[PDB]
Design a protein around this ligand. Structure first.
Ligand SMILES: *C(=O)N[C@@H](CC1CCCCC1)C(=O)N[C@@H](Cc1ccccc1)C(=O)O
Length: 255
């Protein structure tokens, strides 16, 4: 039944969000980014590409409140997806994209890598919940909401996580970042050196095998100049750094 490799970008080639790497900026909003990325993908899968939208990281980050955590000071996937079922999420693209209702208000920056943008800094304030779309956008904030049918934890089981992605699309996950992860370039990440830095929320969109090493295909929210064009591979099948232990997803409501 399950193929040896799977890439959500190949299964759903008319869903451009699955291909798209975001930049969370100088803000600990990865909990929100992994959610709205996977939700964007699932809305396009659920509709056979008839609805393809960038779901607003801004709307989740700023309007969820204490349910989801402490905004830019961190938060948790499971409550992000619950918020999507209860209040829904509007559209919004990248910083100064003018795409959708609430495009992300926090500028892009360099995440543990060299390049032309300012280096990412800490102590970012969470922006306030603004329940209005950017001037000129149609429809209204309330009309632009996309709701979840449900939210659920996927079991700590490689095969269940594979089947979930294979059937319903990309998922959110979370793992323990050790300092060697920050320098990832290519190949299959395994923790070999360095201290624990903290928990990190990402989007899992496939799996594969590289040099007899089974891996998960994962999107980071650190822009495309980090890692492998913004993606990485991580060891699959041993709950490596807890990669299989905090998987969350949900089914969209037909708008
Ligand atoms: C989700 O937002 N995760 C944040 C913390 C991670 C935990 C372990 C170390 C890697 C980072 C995260 O991704 N932070 C971003 C943005 C940032 C940068 C500096 C100060 C505050 C926030 C990061 O690039 O590290």
């Amino acid at each position: 039944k399950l193929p040896a490799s799977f890439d959500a970008r190949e299964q759903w080639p008319q869903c451009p969000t699955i291909k798209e790497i975001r930049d969370q900026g100088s803000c600990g909003s990865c909990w929100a980014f992994g959610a709205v990325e996977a939700i964007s993908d699932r809305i396009c899968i659920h509709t056979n590409a008839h609805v393809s939208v960038e779901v607003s990281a801004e709307d989740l980050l700023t309007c969820c409140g204490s349910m989801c955590g402490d905004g830019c000071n961190g938060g948790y996937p499971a409550e992000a997806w619950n918020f999507w079922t209860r209040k829904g999420l509007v559209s919004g693209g990248l910083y100064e994209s003018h795409v959708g209702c609430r495009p992300y208000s926090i500028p892009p920056c360099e995440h543990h890598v060299n390049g032309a943008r300012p280096p990412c800094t800490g102590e970012g304030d969470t922006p306030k919940c603004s329940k209005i779309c950017e001037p000129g956008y149609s429809p209204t904030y309330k009309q632009d909401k996309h709701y979840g049918y449900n939210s659920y934890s996927v079991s700590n089981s490689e095969k269940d996580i594979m089947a979930e992605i294979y059937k319903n699309g990309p998922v959110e996950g979370a793992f323990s970042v050790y300092s060697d992860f920050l320098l990832y370039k290519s190949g299959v990440y395994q923790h070999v050196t360095g201290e624990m830095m903290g928990g990190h929320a990402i989007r899992i969109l496939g799996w594969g095998v590289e040099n007899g090493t089974p891996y998960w295909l994962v999107a980071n929210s650190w822009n495309t100049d980090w890692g492998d064009n913004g993606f990485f591979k991580i060891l699959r099948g041993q709950d490596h750094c807890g990669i299989e232990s905090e998987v969350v997803a949900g089914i969209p409501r037909t708008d």
